[PDB]
């Protein structure tokens, strides 16, 4: 089931992990360009959505406020999760927000092209990344409206 | 996770529900044109897959062997599940096969456009249809190679 409360197009938000409480950032310099962060609010944590239409109905590109790059999630090369300029040029720039089966107030950030979800954890490296497999709690996110 | 054993293009199969054992048919006369059936093989139970590429990577259109129409699954109007000429002209003609998380040998037939899965049950009418919501065993299918 698609998450029922996806921010309207152009509304800003942070993406905060349910369990760790970390947020995603997306920046243009100093790898990793996309990673998780536990600390003060900064502009590189701010995103909006581009709403997919037609073939991309129910998919979205996740676009940085300060730098305009969109997220990608792939399994073919490193970095696995990163950013790229444009408005979603590539198929792995498009994400579905899938409500959790047990906690309807959180969702997975799912990539149809790569069949992966994003995760955030405090333990094993890489502590932020993507994953193809079973559903775990470290894959759960919230939109934090700004 | 995408079902790991999806038939190659051109390979013919039936879609049989794990629990009811009923098969999907897709025909051109006598509504419902797409429904489930409890008897022996007939040609209108035969399908192949059109492989999505680009924006439709990991999606498939389900194409009738005898009549060439593809399946659709929608929520807006009846019939909810039906068929239509083409090779997937419309967004609701495109399906993802999502492996079950507990039974690795079965999958859900998921429609990205309508956010539904197909079900087959032996209980109340409509005994065949689509659904947006929690996971039940009556949503599980097999590819039956011919």
Short mmCIF file of C-alpha atoms in Angstrom, two decimals:
data_model
loop_
_atom_site.label_atom_id
_atom_site.label_comp_id
_atom_site.label_asym_id
_atom_site.label_seq_id
_atom_site.Cartn_x
_atom_site.Cartn_y
_atom_site.Cartn_z
CA UNK A 1 0.00 0.00 0.00
CA UNK A 2 1.37 3.43 -0.89
CA UNK A 3 1.97 5.70 2.08
CA UNK A 4 -1.23 7.78 2.38
CA UNK A 5 0.43 11.07 3.46
CA UNK A 6 3.03 11.95 0.84
CA UNK A 7 3.90 15.70 0.85
CA UNK A 8 2.36 17.75 -1.94
CA UNK A 9 4.68 18.58 -4.83
CA UNK A 10 7.06 21.38 -3.83
CA UNK A 11 6.52 21.06 -0.08
CA UNK A 12 9.83 20.75 1.79
CA UNK A 13 10.67 18.02 4.26
CA UNK A 14 13.44 16.03 5.88
CA UNK A 15 13.55 12.25 5.65
CA UNK A 16 14.00 10.95 9.19
CA UNK A 17 14.56 7.31 10.03
CA UNK A 18 11.94 5.96 12.46
CA UNK A 19 14.34 3.98 14.66
CA UNK A 20 17.68 5.82 14.57
CA UNK A 21 16.20 9.30 14.33
CA UNK A 22 18.90 10.21 11.79
CA UNK A 23 18.12 12.24 8.67
CA UNK A 24 19.31 11.93 5.08
CA UNK A 25 21.52 14.61 3.57
CA UNK A 26 22.38 15.19 -0.09
CA UNK A 27 25.33 17.44 -0.93
CA UNK A 28 27.63 18.17 -3.86
CA UNK A 29 31.09 17.79 -2.33
CA UNK A 30 33.00 15.43 -0.04
CA UNK A 31 31.90 11.80 -0.43
CA UNK A 32 29.65 10.30 0.71
CA UNK A 33 27.42 12.81 -1.06
CA UNK A 34 24.30 11.10 0.31
CA UNK A 35 24.40 9.71 3.83
CA UNK A 36 22.72 9.90 7.22
CA UNK A 37 23.27 12.52 9.90
CA UNK A 38 22.56 12.99 13.58
CA UNK A 39 22.82 16.68 14.41
CA UNK A 40 21.51 20.20 13.77
CA UNK A 41 19.16 21.05 10.89
CA UNK A 42 21.03 22.01 7.73
CA UNK A 43 19.72 22.88 4.28
CA UNK A 44 21.31 19.83 2.65
CA UNK A 45 18.79 17.72 4.60
CA UNK A 46 15.89 19.43 2.80
CA UNK A 47 14.05 17.78 -0.08
CA UNK A 48 10.98 18.15 -2.21
CA UNK A 49 9.29 15.62 -4.49
CA UNK A 50 8.82 15.62 -8.23
CA UNK A 51 5.59 13.72 -8.82
CA UNK A 52 5.83 11.00 -11.46
CA UNK A 53 2.99 10.85 -13.98
CA UNK A 54 1.91 8.41 -16.67
CA UNK A 55 4.32 5.46 -16.56
CA UNK A 56 5.74 6.96 -13.36
CA UNK A 57 2.43 7.31 -11.55
CA UNK A 58 3.01 6.49 -7.86
CA UNK A 59 6.73 7.14 -8.19
CA UNK A 60 8.62 10.28 -7.16
CA UNK A 61 12.02 11.86 -7.55
CA UNK A 62 13.58 13.12 -4.33
CA UNK A 63 15.16 16.48 -5.10
CA UNK A 64 17.57 18.48 -2.95
CA UNK A 65 16.45 21.98 -2.01
CA UNK A 66 19.90 23.66 -1.94
CA UNK A 67 21.51 21.86 -4.89
CA UNK A 68 18.75 20.48 -7.10
CA UNK A 69 20.19 16.98 -7.47
CA UNK A 70 17.91 13.98 -7.19
CA UNK A 71 18.62 10.77 -5.27
CA UNK A 72 19.40 7.44 -6.88
CA UNK A 73 19.59 3.92 -5.47
CA UNK A 74 21.31 1.13 -7.41
CA UNK A 75 23.17 -2.13 -6.92
CA UNK A 76 25.49 -2.08 -9.93
CA UNK A 77 28.23 0.22 -8.62
CA UNK A 78 29.46 2.40 -5.77
CA UNK A 79 28.18 4.62 -4.44
CA UNK A 80 25.01 2.53 -4.14
CA UNK A 81 22.99 5.51 -2.94
CA UNK A 82 23.92 8.88 -4.34
CA UNK A 83 22.73 11.93 -6.20
CA UNK A 84 22.71 13.23 -9.75
CA UNK A 85 21.65 16.44 -11.49
CA UNK A 86 18.42 16.69 -13.44
CA UNK A 87 14.77 16.01 -12.72
CA UNK A 88 14.93 12.22 -12.79
CA UNK A 89 16.70 11.38 -16.05
CA UNK A 90 17.38 7.76 -15.08
CA UNK A 91 15.01 5.02 -13.98
CA UNK A 92 16.82 4.54 -10.66
CA UNK A 93 15.99 8.17 -9.79
CA UNK A 94 12.38 7.14 -9.08
CA UNK A 95 11.03 5.95 -5.73
CA UNK A 96 7.81 4.50 -4.33
CA UNK A 97 6.82 5.22 -0.72
CA UNK A 98 5.43 1.93 0.57
CA UNK A 99 3.60 1.96 3.87
CA UNK A 100 4.87 -0.56 6.42
CA UNK A 101 2.56 -3.56 6.92
CA UNK A 102 2.60 -3.31 10.71
CA UNK A 103 3.24 0.40 11.40
CA UNK A 104 1.06 2.35 8.94
CA UNK A 105 2.68 5.59 10.09
CA UNK A 106 6.01 4.76 8.49
CA UNK A 107 7.15 3.79 5.01
CA UNK A 108 9.97 2.30 2.98
CA UNK A 109 11.77 4.32 0.33
CA UNK A 110 11.63 1.79 -2.48
CA UNK A 111 13.38 1.89 -5.84
CA UNK A 112 11.59 0.01 -8.60
CA UNK A 113 14.59 0.02 -10.95
CA UNK A 114 16.95 -1.65 -8.44
CA UNK A 115 14.41 -3.45 -6.20
CA UNK A 116 16.01 -1.88 -3.12
CA UNK A 117 14.92 0.03 -0.02
CA UNK A 118 16.95 2.60 1.94
CA UNK A 119 17.95 1.90 5.55
CA UNK A 120 19.49 3.69 8.54
CA UNK A 121 21.21 1.93 11.45
CA UNK A 122 23.78 2.58 14.17
CA UNK A 123 25.74 -0.68 14.00
CA UNK A 124 27.08 -2.55 10.97
CA UNK A 125 28.77 -0.76 8.06
CA UNK A 126 27.62 0.68 5.83
CA UNK A 127 25.36 2.31 8.42
CA UNK A 128 23.31 3.99 5.69
CA UNK A 129 22.57 2.32 2.40
CA UNK A 130 20.21 0.21 0.35
CA UNK A 131 19.01 -3.37 0.61
CA UNK A 132 17.20 -6.05 -1.36
CA UNK A 133 15.60 -8.51 1.03
CA UNK A 134 13.27 -9.02 3.95
CA UNK A 135 11.42 -6.23 5.71
CA UNK A 136 13.22 -4.87 8.76
CA UNK A 137 12.55 -1.91 11.03
CA UNK A 138 15.73 -0.05 10.03
CA UNK A 139 14.10 0.46 6.61
CA UNK A 140 11.33 2.67 8.02
CA UNK A 141 11.13 6.41 7.42
CA UNK A 142 8.99 9.47 8.15
CA UNK A 143 8.46 12.71 6.23
CA UNK A 144 9.33 15.51 8.62
CA UNK A 145 7.58 18.58 7.30
CA UNK A 146 9.38 21.92 7.23
CA UNK B 1 11.73 -8.49 -3.47
CA UNK B 2 10.88 -9.38 -7.06
CA UNK B 3 9.98 -13.02 -7.62
CA UNK B 4 13.24 -14.70 -8.65
CA UNK B 5 11.76 -17.07 -11.29
CA UNK B 6 9.74 -14.97 -13.73
CA UNK B 7 9.22 -16.68 -17.14
CA UNK B 8 11.33 -15.37 -20.02
CA UNK B 9 9.57 -13.46 -22.82
CA UNK B 10 7.63 -15.79 -25.11
CA UNK B 11 7.42 -18.57 -22.51
CA UNK B 12 3.81 -19.64 -22.04
CA UNK B 13 2.27 -20.24 -18.62
CA UNK B 14 -0.91 -20.21 -16.58
CA UNK B 15 -1.40 -18.16 -13.43
CA UNK B 16 -2.73 -20.44 -10.71
CA UNK B 17 -3.59 -19.29 -7.20
CA UNK B 18 -1.60 -21.13 -4.52
CA UNK B 19 -4.51 -21.79 -2.17
CA UNK B 20 -7.70 -22.05 -4.26
CA UNK B 21 -5.90 -23.75 -7.15
CA UNK B 22 -7.99 -21.68 -9.55
CA UNK B 23 -6.50 -20.24 -12.77
CA UNK B 24 -6.96 -16.87 -14.40
CA UNK B 25 -8.57 -16.79 -17.84
CA UNK B 26 -8.77 -13.88 -20.27
CA UNK B 27 -11.31 -14.10 -23.10
CA UNK B 28 -13.14 -11.85 -25.55
CA UNK B 29 -16.80 -12.80 -25.07
CA UNK B 30 -19.23 -13.35 -22.19
CA UNK B 31 -18.40 -11.17 -19.16
CA UNK B 32 -16.51 -11.39 -16.93
CA UNK B 33 -13.81 -11.41 -19.61
CA UNK B 34 -11.14 -11.95 -16.95
CA UNK B 35 -11.95 -14.20 -14.02
CA UNK B 36 -10.89 -17.41 -12.26
CA UNK B 37 -11.76 -20.99 -13.21
CA UNK B 38 -11.71 -24.35 -11.44
CA UNK B 39 -11.35 -26.87 -14.29
CA UNK B 40 -8.86 -28.29 -16.83
CA UNK B 41 -6.66 -26.37 -19.30
CA UNK B 42 -8.18 -24.19 -21.99
CA UNK B 43 -6.23 -21.84 -24.25
CA UNK B 44 -7.61 -18.66 -22.68
CA UNK B 45 -5.67 -19.55 -19.50
CA UNK B 46 -2.40 -19.16 -21.43
CA UNK B 47 -0.25 -16.04 -21.11
CA UNK B 48 3.20 -14.70 -21.88
CA UNK B 49 4.95 -11.64 -20.46
CA UNK B 50 5.93 -8.45 -22.23
CA UNK B 51 9.06 -7.28 -20.45
CA UNK B 52 9.02 -3.66 -19.38
CA UNK B 53 12.18 -1.66 -19.99
CA UNK B 54 13.40 1.81 -19.09
CA UNK B 55 10.72 3.41 -16.91
CA UNK B 56 8.97 0.03 -16.83
CA UNK B 57 11.97 -2.04 -15.73
CA UNK B 58 10.74 -4.74 -13.32
CA UNK B 59 7.17 -4.44 -14.60
CA UNK B 60 5.46 -6.72 -17.12
CA UNK B 61 2.34 -6.80 -19.24
CA UNK B 62 0.41 -10.08 -19.07
CA UNK B 63 -0.56 -10.98 -22.63
CA UNK B 64 -3.10 -13.59 -23.73
CA UNK B 65 -1.75 -16.31 -26.02
CA UNK B 66 -4.96 -16.88 -28.01
CA UNK B 67 -6.31 -13.30 -28.19
CA UNK B 68 -3.30 -11.03 -27.62
CA UNK B 69 -5.01 -8.67 -25.17
CA UNK B 70 -3.24 -7.64 -21.98
CA UNK B 71 -4.62 -7.61 -18.43
CA UNK B 72 -5.47 -4.48 -16.51
CA UNK B 73 -6.18 -3.93 -12.82
CA UNK B 74 -7.82 -0.70 -11.62
CA UNK B 75 -9.94 0.62 -8.73
CA UNK B 76 -11.95 3.36 -10.42
CA UNK B 77 -14.64 1.43 -12.22
CA UNK B 78 -16.04 -2.00 -12.92
CA UNK B 79 -14.78 -4.30 -14.21
CA UNK B 80 -11.88 -3.89 -11.81
CA UNK B 81 -9.79 -6.56 -13.56
CA UNK B 82 -10.12 -6.95 -17.31
CA UNK B 83 -8.37 -7.01 -20.64
CA UNK B 84 -7.56 -4.56 -23.41
CA UNK B 85 -5.89 -4.62 -26.79
CA UNK B 86 -2.32 -3.54 -27.19
CA UNK B 87 0.95 -4.50 -25.62
CA UNK B 88 0.58 -2.30 -22.58
CA UNK B 89 -0.49 1.11 -23.86
CA UNK B 90 -1.98 2.06 -20.51
CA UNK B 91 -0.29 2.42 -17.14
CA UNK B 92 -2.67 0.01 -15.42
CA UNK B 93 -1.49 -2.73 -17.83
CA UNK B 94 1.83 -3.07 -15.96
CA UNK B 95 2.45 -5.54 -13.15
CA UNK B 96 5.21 -6.33 -10.67
CA UNK B 97 5.66 -9.87 -9.33
CA UNK B 98 6.51 -9.50 -5.66
CA UNK B 99 7.81 -12.58 -3.84
CA UNK B 100 6.02 -13.47 -0.62
CA UNK B 101 8.13 -12.84 2.48
CA UNK B 102 7.20 -16.14 4.15
CA UNK B 103 6.64 -18.50 1.21
CA UNK B 104 9.50 -17.94 -1.25
CA UNK B 105 7.73 -20.05 -3.90
CA UNK B 106 4.78 -17.71 -4.44
CA UNK B 107 4.20 -14.08 -5.36
CA UNK B 108 1.68 -11.28 -5.52
CA UNK B 109 0.56 -9.80 -8.83
CA UNK B 110 0.92 -6.11 -8.08
CA UNK B 111 -0.22 -3.17 -10.19
CA UNK B 112 1.81 0.00 -9.75
CA UNK B 113 -0.77 2.30 -11.33
CA UNK B 114 -3.65 1.19 -9.10
CA UNK B 115 -1.66 0.00 -6.05
CA UNK B 116 -3.58 -3.30 -6.03
CA UNK B 117 -2.87 -7.02 -5.88
CA UNK B 118 -4.96 -9.79 -7.48
CA UNK B 119 -6.74 -12.31 -5.25
CA UNK B 120 -8.52 -15.64 -5.65
CA UNK B 121 -10.83 -16.96 -2.93
CA UNK B 122 -13.50 -19.65 -2.46
CA UNK B 123 -15.65 -17.50 -0.18
CA UNK B 124 -17.84 -14.44 -0.83
CA UNK B 125 -18.47 -12.79 -4.19
CA UNK B 126 -16.53 -11.36 -5.85
CA UNK B 127 -14.40 -14.49 -5.52
CA UNK B 128 -11.80 -13.04 -7.91
CA UNK B 129 -10.65 -9.43 -7.97
CA UNK B 130 -8.12 -6.91 -6.79
CA UNK B 131 -7.33 -5.32 -3.44
CA UNK B 132 -5.38 -2.55 -1.75
CA UNK B 133 -4.49 -3.45 1.82
CA UNK B 134 -3.01 -6.07 4.10
CA UNK B 135 -1.32 -9.25 2.93
CA UNK B 136 -3.40 -12.42 2.81
CA UNK B 137 -2.64 -15.90 1.51
CA UNK B 138 -5.44 -15.61 -1.10
CA UNK B 139 -3.21 -13.08 -2.90
CA UNK B 140 -0.51 -15.67 -3.64
CA UNK B 141 0.10 -17.04 -7.15
CA UNK B 142 2.34 -19.42 -9.08
CA UNK B 143 3.58 -19.38 -12.66
CA UNK B 144 2.51 -22.72 -14.11
CA UNK B 145 4.79 -23.44 -17.04
CA UNK B 146 3.22 -25.30 -19.92
#
